[model samples]
Target: GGYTCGANTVPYQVSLNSGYHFCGGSLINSQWVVSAAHCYKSGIQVRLGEDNINVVEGNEQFISASKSIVHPSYNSNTLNNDIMLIKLKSAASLNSRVASISLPTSCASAGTQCLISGWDVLKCLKAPILSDSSCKSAYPGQITSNMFCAGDAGGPVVCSGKLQGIVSWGSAQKNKPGVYTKVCNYVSWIKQTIASN
Candidate 1:
């Protein structure tokens, strides 16, 4: 249990499931969840307030996706602007075990601490923010202002207790750093999208 805690540690964590967990998303509001665009597919089943996938937890709330809105600029090739908004078929019931996470109001500074987890055991591993300059230098042609290098794709980058980024793409198999879609940049779009729909 590297950073194991109860569901309370990540109350915003949501499960994208087929048979079991397929991907991870974060609860932004009662009606919306956000994740990488690459995670989007048909028939998305979401479970909120899940501490463990292996056993049923009474706190969990299962819902189906009503709509999946991928960023218009998302590039499947490079995975640039790889963020998406998921609308639940019905609003999730907010409670102690199920709640929404706040989006970052401003960009995080380099070396700022963060956490990442959406799989079993809730390993709240420590992650430090990397400067765009450092991230750009590390991966040429892949780093964009809309993106920053970080860990695991589709996992939320929780910085200073807010949702800061979405792990966009790179070689997670190599255990190397991946680019994260900066959430602050999309705050306007998120508001607009949620408002329009």
Candidate 2:
């Protein structure tokens, strides 16, 4: 069984819900969260400082999305660039229990161990980054430069304390590695989007 995270342990984790938990995200700043493009839905409400979805912890902060921007080249078919930037209705009130994560300035090397958290239940999974060629071979003609292989979706792959990747999709094959959106490939876009929006 996965170990459940304690209250305030995952301050960057955000719960995306519309009266029901559907996806997870990572807070990148006071007003932005990064999540899966496929998770897009009408009227998304972002919940921060949430350790458990069932309990209303006093540290929880709920904010609505003012804007949702999915990567321009995102492909529903191949799931390329499967990432989205959500602008909050207002900046979140940052605190020890509600903070943001830093984007990666560098990419994680192959075989680097990373942490994927915030997929319901406040649990975290430790996985390793597989080489791009390996992922491409695993999912022939499916993996893109914008994507790498890792573990499950709806969680941020935190490597070396940076936002390295976002779980894009699961490994469909019996023993293939899961796919992730390589965050390093979009740092410029993220900065520009956040600045202009």
Candidate 3:
């Protein structure tokens, strides 16, 4: 797993500029972004930027979601296979700050140390907020062969200086950290599906 400079943290994060709501995401390609299936419904806006998540600076690109593809067998009950992809209306401009995430060729053996970052809720939604907690939290999320978890709902999951996962769900209380959906697991299927479109 790769780490960011200075602070030794994961290098990427997701950002969504949908009206007043801004969220995070992982970059998988110039034209594709991997995030949780629940991020958007039908029509939504998303952005992938480098470094700062507050302002859309540094190799920033804005793209509207052309379509969202969720896993066919995704079980909403158990939150199994909670993955999805966002096809950008246009390809992002690649530069030093903007790049695509790498896919693991194998399962967990590929290296399970990938880092996950996000801005999430720290406590129960209804409880009094903590002064020390940022509206978001970024930390390490485990990378399983089939999935990776990060962020709260609408947060980003960055790893190895690249965007990889999208924060999805966790405990239903809206306080605990949420799970991220690893987009790399379905790279082959995604390629095939996108090509067919």
Candidate 4:
């Protein structure tokens, strides 16, 4: 849903079969990817090392899914904790065109012009962070920790760099907002999951 500039602007950003670019992902490393649990399926693999979808490039690598772990408590209807980790059958190699991102220590402050990225974030342009209540009505419990409401305006959500949430889902219409799984809330769990496995 966005047109990110730079042929190699967001190197860490990648697609899931191109047809489902909506289910975009950021490389946690050469081997791991951080994405939404909602985008899971059994077959198929993730394609990295390219920017444009239609083009057939040499750097492109298709890694099979060796393991995918969605949050144990994730609920389909509510879509809470909609994040997941994708482990590639083989690891990826980093280069100037392929690297990890820097993560933010805290969530985006209200109204802070932040870099957002996603397949459904409209133009994926730089946009201000929205208030928490912006997309709360879609679900009950007022969108607690582990999740946040982000403005539709976007940038590349990736690897380690400033990643605060995972694309959870929400109203994609104009003026509406997007929901994400808060990276902060799952910090401990992510470390444990990445280590134990």
Best by TM-score: 2
Query: Model 3: how far is 2 from its true place, Å?
Result: 15
Model 3, 1-197: lDDT tens digits are: 22332211322344555674445556667777666666657666765553444454445566788878877766666555666667788887766556666654543322223344544211111111112132233222332334443324544444443334445655545545445555556668767876765
How close to the true structure is residue 34 of candidate 4, measured as C-alpha lDDT?
79
Off by over 4 Å in 4: 18-22, 119-123, 137-142, 152-160, 172-174
lDDT (Cα) of model 4:
0.65
Better of 3 and 4 by lDDT: 4
Lowest lDDT 10-mer window, candidate 4? Answer: 152-161
TM-score of 4: 0.82
Model 3 TM: 0.63
- What TM-score does candidate 2 get on C-alpha atoms? 0.93
Per-candidate TM-scores read 0.92, 0.93, 0.63, 0.82
Better of 2 and 4 by lDDT: 2
lDDT of 1 by residue, 1-197 (tens): 24675665788888888776878889999999999999878989888888887778678899999999999998888887889999999999999888888987898988897887767555566778877777887787777788876543576888998899886766625535756888999999998999999
User: Clash pairs of candidate 1?
Assistant: none
> How are the candidates ranked when ordered by lDDT, highest leading?
2, 1, 4, 3
